Amino acid sequence: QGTVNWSVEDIVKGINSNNLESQLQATQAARKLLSREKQPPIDNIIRAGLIPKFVSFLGKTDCSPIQFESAWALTNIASGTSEQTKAVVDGGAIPAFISLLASPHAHISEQAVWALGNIAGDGSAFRDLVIKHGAIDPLLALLAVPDLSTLACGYLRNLTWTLSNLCRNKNPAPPLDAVEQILPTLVRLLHHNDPEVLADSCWAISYLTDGPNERIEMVVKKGVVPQLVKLLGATELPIVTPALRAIGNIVTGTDEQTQKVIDAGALAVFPSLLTNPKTNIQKEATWTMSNITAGRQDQIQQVVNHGLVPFLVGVLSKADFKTQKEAAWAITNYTSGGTVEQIVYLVHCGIIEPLMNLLSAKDTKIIQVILDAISNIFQAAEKLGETEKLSIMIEECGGLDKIEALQRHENESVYKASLNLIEKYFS
């Protein structure tokens, strides 16, 4: 096969000949160039003025191979910078690719799915432009099968991916009714048994849940929460990561929505998520915990009965800083909504020492966060007449020095909190 390594000017020559075959051959040369690992000459291809020509080949139904080669060619240009994508879009590729969705040749519509995927992936505008040109109907149609197993592995992977991009980006979020239209198929995909369909399904859902409550509610209302929780316990990190994000998003919404996650059994996975070797899982799991401890006392209670407080204490005691920061918050949140008993309980789990050690971190934000929390804790200890035994505690682990040296920390609300705390509990 000597359509290998052509020069651009050669590709041009051919595509301009009035010879459908010569053109087919050159377009394949074009694809091959663009498929190379080391810096495919996308720019010069664009610069050569080729995009419109490829675009018009998409429409050549007699000559399927050219349809495919040009499809692939544009697919690859469309995968580069935004500007590269913009060039594909400016050529009129979008309705052309949509038309190809119904091509009788699977390998061709797959290419069309792929390209629409890249275009929608550029960002919200292209995404909604794909949507306006009516891509969503024909995509869904290819998934209109009694059993998803009967479709080819990488064909379904591509559709799942493209679909996820139609759910991706946020300013603005995708159109509500486009989401309504996608959801049922997404749900059906969230249940399929390919690790890769599951990862992308999870992302799709994670994107759609990253907004205001009404959005979360669309999702939660299709009852995917049980199924998200299950996935949360998967062995494949490519699946845990996006599932955990979905759940993390959902618990930012109403307490009602939060409770769906609790009922689903979510909390049971946390012992292991809060100890996970992958740094980011831990950060994200901890964050999620912070949004649960931000809920009602009976929700705080469920965190307690799953024995997650030790896990928080653990995370406060040793994790990379960014996780410890979330633990800090999770605790403050806890100490805000919590009952007296519950705040007591936290201290009996040994929350005071590891909290104190963090006061010497040089991150201004977290210190406030911790001090609000100490504040909060003394408050429950006042209601019990125990501000003493607690002060003593904070002394014996060197917390007292750390706060008492903190009136001379620059920040305003900082030195006032410490000031207050010192005055109020320490003389």
Binding site: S35, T75, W114, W161, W203
Partner: peptide
Amino acid sequence: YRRRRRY
């Protein structure tokens, strides 16, 4: 995962 190139 934004965008994908082929082969």
